Ligand binder design. Structure first.
Ligand SMILES: O=S(=O)(O)[C@]1(CNC2CCCCC2)C[C@@H](O)[C@@H](O)C1
Length: 658
């Protein structure tokens, strides 16, 4: 249909604009759609963009509003005191503010659907909420509506929720337009989506992005596909990947690099209310925190991730057990058989399950998928599914059988309930991935796995050496391979920290010289340097000039291939805030060749200081642009759990940054 009203170029300068005469007589029927293209790069803390109200004395709670907050939250109110209805629907981190020095034109579509009794909000082509109610309130049927307003709500003849911004276009339709119709509305987005709700992963949530530029020019990304809301392990989480062959313009349909099948891949709306939001899938195995590198020797792409057994995460992993028995310099995975209270078995050569107490082999073997075989034949378990149909999270068997895996809750043989690191490889630059293999333990029989630093591993320029950063209590633990990941050794570097989440990323400043930037508990990003290709490490220093919170956030880091201001350059990506995970920046530093020190010369704001920015991935695209894939929300805040389509990709040029 055609809009019953359409106007534009409205400047909202803390002063309401009345559009009553142009709109109120046209409002008809119980279903409406509002389409609004608007900018707000200096919003007030809470402001209404559009209001429909009964403006009379005594009726201050009779109105409809579309509002936003300076946090980037968008919402609506739908209120009628005589009907006893007071609806408030919203979602944090729904908006953009600025991009490349210009206010972003956000495209908002709000559908009020009387037949399905549903209110649905889209911003920038993303469905941010969809709420069905028992008693529907048509926005046109609020008792005594007599005012239509831009940039405020008129209550008792006075302006509430005054807005600063502009509405470039606004249209109203007397119909609830379909999802299909919504998708045809042209957007002006500064970002794109690589992974998204409803894609091939069937995860509704994503966290922990990575990017890496391959020698062929293909750009590869990995991610946590998180099924049970945004929670870290314990949960159901898989590692997914996608690549671009056109410098980030388009991306492949995602595939899995590491996955478990003990729980179904379900697209679930995870509850955001204060009773249920901490609901957590508690019987599933998971992978978490991935990292990518390309190997020059084999040409293979190598991906590492943490592996969590069923119901295990950082908080409950056995810190004093590696999960392996060392026997004469060989490490064997320990197993516990159902019924036993101890681990009386090991996985030996050729996958033979060996009884340690009788020193004889059993009739059981483990294949390369870590699946259990008895007399060469595959054992199975029954898969689980999750639901909230009873009002709380329930995890239950679903009638489907899958191969029995030693990482599963239902397995006859189970691994130690602790965290591990696994690796997979791809021989076709991310078009498929091999079955994962566990890395050996690096800190002895009585220490859990170190924790992989998400992002990039480091391939050295003048050798075939690969390095992956990991952390544990009291140190960074660099994992080094000189043979395409076939064998590994550790290089430990002490850090002035107990129990820190010391997520670290590396850049090669010049041949054999590596600088590692890492998260701390001090509110400052730290660094150390190696001058022997990772064998040994310097004391720790700190960057003055970038702020983090007390708990910190992952920092991603690259060495740019081109000179900037005639100097070699490093680029960091991080929130720059003492307060929260917000105020995302790229920080460009120039290297002083005298002493390898870095002058942090340029700061580019990704978006408003108050808008969310958490974990991030950066890479130089083959065309010398910079690609950034990042969590556009505050991933620490307990108010911003379980948001869909907040991991977003942008393309920047060096001139944008300087
Ligand atoms: O120098 S590499 O370590 O091989 C790497 C790629 N360099 C190309 C150089 C040519 C321009 C594009 C980026 C940098 C890391 O951030 C990864 O993306 C891999």
């Amino acid at each position: 249909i055609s809009p019953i009203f359409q106007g534009g170029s409205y400047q909202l300068n803390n002063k309401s604009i009345d559009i009553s005469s142009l709109l109120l007589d046209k409002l008809s029927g119980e279903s409406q759609t509002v389409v609004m293209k608007f900018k707000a790069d200096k919003p007030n803390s809470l402001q209404a963009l559009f209001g429909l109200s009964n403006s009379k004395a005594g009726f201050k709670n009779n109105y409809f509003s579309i509002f936003m907050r300076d946090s980037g939250e968008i919402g609506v109110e739908i209120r009628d005191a005589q009907k006893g209805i007071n609806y408030l629907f919203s979602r944090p981190a729904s908006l953009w503010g600025k991009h490349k020095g210009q206010a972003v034109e956000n495209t908002l579509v709000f559908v009020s659907d009387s037949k399905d009794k549903t209110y649905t909000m889209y911003v920038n082509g993303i469905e941010v909420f969809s709420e069905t109610v028992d008693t529907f309130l048509p926005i046109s049927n609020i008792n005594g509506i007599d005012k239509a307003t831009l940039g405020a709500v008129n209550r008792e003849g006075k302006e509430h929720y005054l807005a600063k911004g502009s509405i470039d276009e606004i249209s109203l339709f007397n119909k609830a337009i379909s999802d299909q119709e919504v998708s045809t509305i042209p957007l002006s987005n500064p970002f794109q989506l690589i992974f998204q709700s409803g894609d091939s992963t069937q995860a509704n949530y994503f966290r922990i992005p990575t990017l890496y530029t391959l020698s062929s020019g293909r750009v590869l990304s990995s991610i946590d596909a998180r099924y049970g809301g945004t929670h870290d392990s314990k949960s159901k989480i898989n590692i997914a990947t996608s690549y671009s062959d056109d410098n980030g313009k388009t991306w492949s349909e995602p595939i899995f690099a590491m996955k478990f099948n003990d729980y179904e891949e379900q697209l679930v709306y995870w509850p955001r209310d204060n009773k249920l939001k901490n609901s957590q899938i508690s019987g599933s195995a998971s992978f978490i925190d991935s990292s990518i590198v390309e190997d020059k020797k084999s040409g293979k792409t190598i991906l590492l991730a943490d592996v969590m057994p069923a119901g295990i995460g950082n908080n409950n992993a056995n810190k004093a057990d590696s999960g392996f028995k060392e026997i004469n310099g060989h490490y064997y995975l320990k197993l516990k058989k159902n019924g036993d209270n101890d681990f009386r078995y090991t996985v030996r050569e050729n996958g033979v399950v060996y009884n340690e107490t009788t020193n004889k082999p059993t009739n059981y073997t483990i294949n390369d998928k870590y699946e259990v075989l008895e007399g060469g034949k595959s054992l199975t378990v029954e898969q689980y599914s999750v639901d909230f149909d009873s009002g709380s999270l329930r995890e239950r068997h679903n009638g489907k059988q899958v191969p029995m895996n030693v990482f599963y809750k239902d397995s006859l043989f189970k691994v130690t309930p602790t965290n591990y690191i696994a690796m997979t490889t791809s021989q076709n630059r991310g078009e498929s991935w091999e079955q994962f293999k566990l890395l050996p333990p690096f800190l002895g029989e009585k220490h859990n796995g170190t924790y992989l630093c998400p992002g990039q591993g480091l391939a050295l320029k003048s050798s075939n050496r690969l390095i992956f950063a990991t952390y544990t209590s009291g140190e960074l633990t660099y994992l080094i391979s000189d043979d395409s990941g076939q064998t590994w050794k550790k290089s430990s570097a002490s850090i002035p920290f107990k129990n820190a989440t010391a997520e670290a990323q590396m850049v090669e400043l010049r041949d054999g010289v590596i600088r590692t930037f890492f998260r701390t508990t001090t509110g400052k990003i730290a660094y150390m340097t190696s001058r022997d290709s990772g064998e040994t490490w310097s004391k720790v220093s700190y960057i003055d000039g970038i702020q983090q919170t007390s708990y910190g956030t992952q920092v991603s880091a690259i060495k740019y291939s081109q000179l900037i201001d005639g100097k070699e350059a490093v680029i960091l990506s991080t929130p720059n805030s003492r307060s929260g995970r917000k105020g995302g920046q790229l920080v460009v530093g120039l290297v002083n060749k005298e002493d390898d020190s870095i002058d942090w010369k340029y700061h580019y704001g990704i978006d408003l200081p108050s808008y969310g920015y958490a974990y991030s991935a950066i890479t130089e695209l083959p065309n010398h642009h910079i690609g950034v894939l990042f969590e556009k929300y505050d991933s620490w805040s307990r108010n911003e759990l379980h948001l869909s389509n907040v991991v977003q990709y942008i393309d920047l040029e060096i001139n944008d940054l300087t």
